[PDB]
Amino acid sequence: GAGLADALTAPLDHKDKSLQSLTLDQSVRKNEKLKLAAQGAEKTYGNGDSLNTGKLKNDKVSRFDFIRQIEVDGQLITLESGEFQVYKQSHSALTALQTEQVQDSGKMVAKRQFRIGDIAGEHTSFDKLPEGGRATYRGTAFGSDDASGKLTYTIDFAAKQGHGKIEHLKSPELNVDLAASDIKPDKKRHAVISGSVLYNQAEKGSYSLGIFGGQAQEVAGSAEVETAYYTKDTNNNLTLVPGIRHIGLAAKQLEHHHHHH
Numbered sequence: 552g553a554g555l556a557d558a559l560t561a562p563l564d565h566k567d568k569s570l571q572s573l574t575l576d577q578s579v580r581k582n583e584k585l586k587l588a589a590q591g592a593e594k595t596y597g598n599g600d601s602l603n604t605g606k607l608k609n610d611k612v613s614r615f616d617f618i619r620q621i622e623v624d625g626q627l628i629t630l631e632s633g634e635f636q637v638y639k640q641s642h643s644a645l646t647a648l649q650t651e652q653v654q655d656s657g658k659m660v661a662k663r664q665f666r667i668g669d670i671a672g673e674h675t676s677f678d679k680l681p682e683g684g685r686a687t688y689r690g691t692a693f694g695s696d697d698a699s700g701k702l703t704y705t706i707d708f709a710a711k712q713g714h715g716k717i718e719h720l721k722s723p724e725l726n727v728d729l730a731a732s733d734i735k736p737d738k739k740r741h742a743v744i745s746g747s748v749l750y751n752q753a754e755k756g757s758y759s760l761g762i763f764g765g766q767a768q769e770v771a772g773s774a775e776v777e778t779a780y781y782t783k784d785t786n787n788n789l790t791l792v793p794g795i796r797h798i799g800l801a802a803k804q805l806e807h808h809h810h811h812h
Contacts, residue, residue: 558605560591567603569609570643573671579597582598586617587615587616587617587635589613610803616634632659638799642765643672643673647693648666672763676740677734680708684709688802694796704729706767715728725796727749730746776795779794
């Protein structure tokens with residue numbers, strides 16, 4: 552697939568597959584500039600700009616190089632550097648950022664972080680949900696340095712309650728269970744599910760999924776798993792501090808098309 556450079560250069564096309572535009576909001580805030588570069592050329596994005604996801608492959612992670620910067624007195628200052636990840640589905644898509652370089656004034660230090668960017672798509676109205684039956688969504692859960700997570704979720708529309716499970720991630724602590732939670736309409740009446748995660752029947756963080764698709768075809772959100780990492784003091788004093796591991800979640804129902812299997 553060589554159309555990943557077309558996502559940064561070619562305009563929006565109505566014939567492109569599935570979700571063709573992603574509004575970059577949380578990925579780049581305020582006056583910041585998010586420069587994406589991959590394959591051939593590059594494109595700079597501002598807050599609210601559109602990402603031409605239509606020319607990216609569905610159900611796969613596209614990887615760009617991102618430089619998050621800001622202008623100070625007419626000159627761009629590199630705030631963050633790393634890899635920008637985009638997972639595209641048919642009615643929803645989400646982005647993630649792997650921090651590789653931060654500031655620490657004029658230089659850049661090497662720090663590795665990972666956060667979830669935007670989670671956008673055709674939000675399903677809570678007032679337009681099915682009434683009865685259980686939908687099975689299967690897809691990907693991807694975290695820092697691991698895109699092979701297998702996400703499985705199921706929603707009961709008669710009880711308005713869904714639950715899930717994450718498997719096959721490299722770190723066995725991240726293979727956590729998505730506890731049962733109710734379907735609730737958010738501020739914009741969109742159908743969202745928020746709950747906790749369970750490892751060995753113990754709370755280890757939270758998770759938030761959004762229902763996307765005109766007929767609730769897909770679910771897309773993120774999970775925050777509670778972990779603990781080491782901090783090396785200025786005198787080599789280790790401290791076991793708590794941290795959060797962010798996991799991108801994106802699943803879809805099994806499709807049945809008119810003219811192909």
